[PDB]
Amino acid sequence: ELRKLDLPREAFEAASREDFELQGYAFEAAEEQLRRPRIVHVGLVQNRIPLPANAPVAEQVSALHRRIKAIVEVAAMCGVNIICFQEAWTMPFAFCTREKLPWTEFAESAEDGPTTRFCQKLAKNHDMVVVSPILERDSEHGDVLWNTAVVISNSGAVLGKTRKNHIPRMEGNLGHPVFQTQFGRIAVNICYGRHHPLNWLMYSINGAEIIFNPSATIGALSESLWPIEARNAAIANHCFTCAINRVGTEHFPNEFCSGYFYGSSYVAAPDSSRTPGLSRSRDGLLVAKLDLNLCQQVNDVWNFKMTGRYEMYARELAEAVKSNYSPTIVKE
Amino acid sequence: ELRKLDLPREAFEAASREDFELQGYAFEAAEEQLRRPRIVHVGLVQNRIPLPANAPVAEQVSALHRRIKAIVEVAAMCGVNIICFQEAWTMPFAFCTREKLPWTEFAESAEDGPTTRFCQKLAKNHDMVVVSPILERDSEHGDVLWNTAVVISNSGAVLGKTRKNHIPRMEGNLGHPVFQTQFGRIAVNICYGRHHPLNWLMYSINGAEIIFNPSATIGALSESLWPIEARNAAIANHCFTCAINRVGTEHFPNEFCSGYFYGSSYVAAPDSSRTPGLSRSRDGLLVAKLDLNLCQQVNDVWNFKMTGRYEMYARELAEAVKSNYSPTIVKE
Numbered sequence: 001e002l003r004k005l006d007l008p009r010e011a012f013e014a015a016s017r018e019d020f021e022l023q024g025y026a027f028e029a030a031e032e033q034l035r036r037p038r039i040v041h042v043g044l045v046q047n048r049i050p051l052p053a054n055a056p057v058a059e060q061v062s063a064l065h066r067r068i069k070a071i072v073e074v075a076a077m078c079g080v081n082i083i084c085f086q087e088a089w090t091m092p093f094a095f096c097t098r099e100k101l102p103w104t105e106f107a108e109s110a111e112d113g114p115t116t117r118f119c120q121k122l123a124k125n126h127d128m129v130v131v132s133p134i135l136e137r138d139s140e141h142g143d144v145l146w147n148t149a150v151v152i153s154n155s156g157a158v159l160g161k162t163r164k165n166h167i168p169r170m171e172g173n174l175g176h177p178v179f180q181t182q183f184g185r186i187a188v189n190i191c192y193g194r195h196h197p198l199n200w201l202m203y204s205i206n207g208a209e210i211i212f213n214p215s216a217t218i219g220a221l222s223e224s225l226w227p228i229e230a231r232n233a234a235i236a237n238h239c240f241t242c243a244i245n246r247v248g249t250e251h252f253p254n255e256f257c258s259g260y261f262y263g264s265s266y267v268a269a270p271d272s273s274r275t276p277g278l279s280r281s282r283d284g285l286l287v288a289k290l291d292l293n294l295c296q297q298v299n300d301v302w303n304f305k306m307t308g309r310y311e312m313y314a315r316e317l318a319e320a321v322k323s324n325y326s327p328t329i330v331k332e
Numbered sequence: 333e334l335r336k337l338d339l340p341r342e343a344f345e346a347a348s349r350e351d352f353e354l355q356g357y358a359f360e361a362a363e364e365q366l367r368r369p370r371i372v373h374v375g376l377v378q379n380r381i382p383l384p385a386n387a388p389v390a391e392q393v394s395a396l397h398r399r400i401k402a403i404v405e406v407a408a409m410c411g412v413n414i415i416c417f418q419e420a421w422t423m424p425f426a427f428c429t430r431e432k433l434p435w436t437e438f439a440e441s442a443e444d445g446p447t448t449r450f451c452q453k454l455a456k457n458h459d460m461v462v463v464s465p466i467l468e469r470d471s472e473h474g475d476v477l478w479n480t481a482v483v484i485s486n487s488g489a490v491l492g493k494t495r496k497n498h499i500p501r502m503e504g505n506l507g508h509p510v511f512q513t514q515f516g517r518i519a520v521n522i523c524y525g526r527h528h529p530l531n532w533l534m535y536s537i538n539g540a541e542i543i544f545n546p547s548a549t550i551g552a553l554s555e556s557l558w559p560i561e562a563r564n565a566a567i568a569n570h571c572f573t574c575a576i577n578r579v580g581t582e583h584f585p586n587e588f589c590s591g592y593f594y595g596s597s598y599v600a601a602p603d604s605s606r607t608p609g610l611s612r613s614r615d616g617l618l619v620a621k622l623d624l625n626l627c628q629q630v631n632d633v634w635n636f637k638m639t640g641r642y643e644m645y646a647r648e649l650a651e652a653v654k655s656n657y658s659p660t661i662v663k664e
Contacts, residue, residue: 151662165641166640166641168634171641176648178662179662192634192639195636196640198529198530202645205649206652206660224603225604228563235557235560236527272553272557273556303501307499307500307524307528308498308528310530313530313534314652317534317642317645317646320537321642328507328508328509329512330510332485332489332491
């Protein structure tokens with residue numbers, strides 16, 4: 001049972017006026033202050049698309065920008081230092097991506113498209129790091145489309161970008177970057193990548209203290225997996241994880257790729273504790289106070305990085321991927 | 333909510349007489365029989381040591397053999413094909429292992445010590461594969477001690493052995509063997525190895541359909557992790573996992589290495605479903621009917637082996653383990 005944050009009255013009033021859920025929790029070290037507190041407040045935003053999926057793209061996108069602006073203003077009242085939006089936050093979701101409409105109209109330059117420029121202004125204005133998952137057009141490489149997250153500094157400068165490494169059956173070509181911010185080292189595991197323990201691992205190995213998982217996912221099976229995967233990744237990697245899913249029923253028609261999004265955004269910690277999920281249907285802001293030195297408390301008990309034998313696994317995996325690999329199997 | 337098995341009256345009577353909990357559950361494919369059923373019944377045994385930790389070793393061990401025999405007889409009434417015992421099942425547990433008493437008296441030959449020979453007789457008598465986690469003396473290699481599990485065929489023949497790959501701060505030197513049995517391909521993730529997603533992964537890659545996790549673990553933190561780790565490993569690897577922990581308070585004195593064991597053995601499935609745990613205090617037998625072709629149903633939705641990019645991770649991990657590795661980190 002995590003301590004609830006005494007979020008300001010002004011924030012609660014604004015969230016009520018703006019019709020979104022506001023929740024706040026703390027993950028704090030043991031009362032005895034053995035080590036230094038390394039406190040960062042994170043914000044997770046889940047929302048439905050404001051306009052119908054067929055609405056003009058300029059209008060859909062600007063309506064989403066205005067919606068997020070209102071929520072981030074409340075996040076700032078609560079002292080959020082790092083905020084992350086949901087997967088493909090400026091568009092209706094569809095299971096697939098193709099090089100035709102509507103995708104090609106929604107797609108933007110990661111470095112200087114209107115959503116990134118909007119986020120730079122937000123970030124600077126509230127002294128807040130902003131993580132923006134978008135559909136990217138890479139104009140330097142043939143206009144190919146990527147599922148990309150852009151990381152914006154609290155100074156308003158673009159820190160860089162990270163791409164979706166795992167795609168259900170466009171696979172990310174940027175490895176596992178970690179962004180050093182004023183408020184901690186962060187990484188972004190996009191959507192379906194939550195299903196791959198190795199994806200979480202490489203971000204942690206490269207130094208991530210917080211791994212965000214912006215997702216856009218539907219159905220009974222996905223919802224059953226939702227409370228387990230991101231939660232386990234926090235434990236296994238001694239880090240914090242932030243699971244985000246959108247809400248609402250609106251979608252591009254299923255004929256576009258030939259859906260019900262369940263929200264339930266949450267934060268999980270290195271000690272196995274987690275926040276209650278946000279609503280399954282309502283727009284929402286989850287504020288979490290993280291002590292990033294909590295891992296040091298966990299590491300008095302176990303250190304999985306020290307006992308991981310990663311050099312051994314590198315060798316075993318390399319052997320396993322070979323085309324002539326006969327598995328290590330014993331028979332009578 | 334899993335279907336409970338209608339275990340025979342005789343089994344319930346015997347379990348009552350013998351003072352252990354008996355539970356039975358089914359993990360079945362969707363009613364529509366699209367594919368073939370591949371049905372195996374597994375048994376998980378948790379127990380306390382019968383005699384005080386200081387009791388003579390021959391007596392402690394033979395009392396444990398007699399206890400397990402009574403439970404396995406009930407397992408056979410229930411149609412169990414593969415049974416697994418808890419970590420170091422023939423001895424009191426201690427956090428450490430040293431090359432002195434009491435450990436050196438408890439330790440045995442994996443190939444032909446009295447516990448393995450006992451298991452060969454059990455296995456043959458009930459047509460049951462038996463997985464026996466013991467403390468091994470390796471006499472061919474300087475009498476060094478290992479945390480080892482011996483896998484015995486339903487014919488009574490020794491199939492081979494597997495060693496504990498991960499040790500808290502003796503690290504296993506046998507890789508990730510998988511045992512092909514008449515009732516499926518199995519592997520053993522011993523104890524603390526449950527904390528390492530890569531350990532589970534390599535067993536699955538090498539072909540395991542069921543990964544047993546015999547453990548001996550105590551404390552509030554461990555119990556908090558218990559429902560998450562083995563459960564996630566079933567999901568990530570599209571397999572069944574079997575989490576086993578001992579019960580009782582008895583232990584070697586803490587001064588030996590300078591404890592309360594919580595049971596709660598359970599089975600987790602590729603669809604994220606799991607059994608309710610066995611008792612936190614009572615001896616127990618959990619029977620689970622597994623359809624090993626359930627993964628094929630899950631793989632109509634997602635196949636994580638196909639989307640895992642293991643060749644890419646082999647390369648990234650190898651680079652990461654190097655002594656001169658500067659992580660992939662982006663700064664302003």
